[PDB]
Design a protein around this nucleic acid. Structure first.
Ligand SMILES: [Zn+2]
Ligand SMILES: [Zn+2]
Lengths: 107, 94, 66, 93, 145
RNA sequence: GCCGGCUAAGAUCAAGUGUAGUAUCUGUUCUUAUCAGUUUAAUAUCUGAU
């Protein structure tokens, strides 16, 4: 009672980001058009996974939070603000749409 | 064997007219509770805290060692209604 | 009346979404000044003309199954 | 623990609060940096409702405000912020 | 006057405590030293339980006095005391202590509690990092602009 | 977690404890099977026959 995975993937003008589970929605053409946004961000990888992205790799083996050197390298007068607010390092992380996956750090 | 990380605090210089509720209130300032079997320990008098008032010493326990260290560093010579009291780790007493 | 008018919910049809889209996109046209003095320069019509056109288009725009 | 509100036409009535529920906002429920004053509807100050707390629902001791984190979010522009629900209705103990 | 006014703050009277809080605050207003560090630390530990009283006047006076108290005592000492106080005073009045940490952020520069509280997250405890996050919440909620 | 697997990967029934609320623990079964309908993004589940 709906377009097949090939008919709903060929009628659209951008099947490069087509999904098998997306073809069974109520409006496959509308979802395909919305997914064809310029620089949007799709749904995360935990849409169908039933592990909650934390039960599978529950054995995390890494430090909790490494002390950044932007602030670590009377408490201090001429070096506290001169090392944290002066010798600060810019945190270089993802820019726009790097949605966190289950692991997202090990791979 | 174990030297540091002690959870036993010895409070000395307490008046004999003190009670257990006041000791619990003073211990709550740096801890939460040590009522493992029923409750927490108290001062040891001559006749098991029955005839005498107190043998100038009281024992206090805490859940963590950092809290006990902070209490010993801050509650040193704390002034209670009768007098000033000192805090120690062991003091060669109990 | 004014509970949540302006957006559907979990099974909102695409047509009923675009209808609210246009119906709330013209109010920013009849009320806003830059987007109303800019459309009267393209269509080359007065403010009242373009405003009445946009108001009459609010009956059932986007392509109505009426 | 999802509290409900009146959310009617915000009249020209100022807000209030109890001696214990005076600091926190009627919606944000926070004591941090009150920004604007809360209001009520016509059915919030009428006879017995004169001078009642918007959170405690009893005596008023001050004016009901909103939190700065709740007024910048345009939450104060909603209806009557009176905390009333099926349990906290007019016929309540 | 400091040791004489110290037990007065322990009273349960509403107006009496409200006046004593402002008195202790103004005591450290102009000169503000006038004390041993242990006495100021004990006064702060006693007033930390009154930061969430029923009367909002006492809650405002406590925050108005604790700022000057922490500015006169010192950033590191007050920060360490508040951090050690996080584990004690179980979660019925614990959050107020976190607010006191925010008071330090409102009383001192941002790098007075940021680098000291950052090392409090390296501990692998669950309800230690949890408390650190619960404190950073109120910190960024009351730090302002 | 260890060097694809060793059934700690999921759903579900009965009872106990307890909160303002969330919950926590013990004992099961798990269709090893097929078709039709409901339903699920797909499983699952349930409804009937064999
Ligand atoms: Zn109230
Ligand atoms: Zn109302």
């Amino acid at each position: 009672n709906r377009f097949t995975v090939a008919e709903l993937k060929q009628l659209v003008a951008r099947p490069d980001v087509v999904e098998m589970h997306d073809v069974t929605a109520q409006d496959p053409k509308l979802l395909v058009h919305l997914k064809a946004t310029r620089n949007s961000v799709p749904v995360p990888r935990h849409w169908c996974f039933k592990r909650k992205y934390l039960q599978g790799k529950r054995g995390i083996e890494k430090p909790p939070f490494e002390l950044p050197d932007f602030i670590k390298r009377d408490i201090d007068y001429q070096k506290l603000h001169d090392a944290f607010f002066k010798w600060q390092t810019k945190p270089k992380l993802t820019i726009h749409g790097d949605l966190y996956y289950e692991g997202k750090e090990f791979e | 064997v174990e030297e540091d990380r002690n959870t036993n605090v010895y409070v000395s210089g307490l008046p004999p007219d003190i009670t257990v509720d006041e000791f619990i209130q003073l211990m709550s300032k740096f801890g939460i509770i040590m009522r493992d079997p029923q409750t927490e320990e108290f001062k040891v008098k001559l006749y098991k805290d029955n005839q005498g008032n107190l043998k100038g010493d009281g024992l206090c326990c805490y859940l963590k060692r950092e809290s006990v260290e902070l209490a010993l560093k801050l509650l040193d010579e704390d002034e209670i209604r009768g007098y000033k009291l000192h805090v120690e780790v062991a003091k060669f007493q109990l | 009346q004014s509970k949540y008018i302006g957006t559907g919910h979990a099974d909102t049809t695409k047509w009923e979404w675009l209808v609210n889209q246009h119906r709330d996109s013209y109010c920013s046209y009849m009320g806003h000044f830059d987007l109303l003095n800019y459309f009267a320069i393209a269509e080359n019509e007065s403010k009242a003309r373009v405003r009445f056109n946009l108001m009459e288009k609010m009956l059932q725009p986007c392509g109505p199954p009426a | 623990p999802d509290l409900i509100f009146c959310r009617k036409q915000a009249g020209v009535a100022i807000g209030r609060l109890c001696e214990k529920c005076d600091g926190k906002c009627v919606i944000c429920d926070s004591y941090v940096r009150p920004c604007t004053l809360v209001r009520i509807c016509d059915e919030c100050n009428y006879g017995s409702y004169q001078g009642r707390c918007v959170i405690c629902g009893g005596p008023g001791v001050s004016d009901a405000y909103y939190c700065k984190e709740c007024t910048i979010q345009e939450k104060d522009r909603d209806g009557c912020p009176k905390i009333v629900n099926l349990g906290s209705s007019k016929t309540d103990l | 006057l400091l040791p004489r006014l110290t037990p007065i703050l322990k009273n349960r009277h509403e107006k009496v405590q409200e006046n004593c809080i402002d008195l202790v605050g103004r005591i450290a207003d102009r000169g503000a030293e006038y004390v041993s560090a242990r006495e100021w630390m004990r006064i702060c530990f006693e007033l930390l339980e009154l930061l969430k009283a029923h009367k909002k006047a006492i809650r405002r006076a406590t925050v108005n006095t604790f700022g000057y108290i922490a500015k006169a005592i010192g950033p590191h000492d007050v920060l360490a005391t508040l951090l050690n106080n996080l584990k004690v005073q179980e979660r019925q009045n614990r959050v107020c202590t976190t607010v006191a940490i925010a008071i330090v952020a409102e009383t001192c520069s941002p790098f007075t509690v940021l680098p000291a509280l950052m090392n409090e997250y390296r501990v692998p405890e669950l309800n230690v990092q949890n408390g650190v996050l619960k404190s950073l919440s109120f910190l960024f909620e009351y730090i302002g602009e």
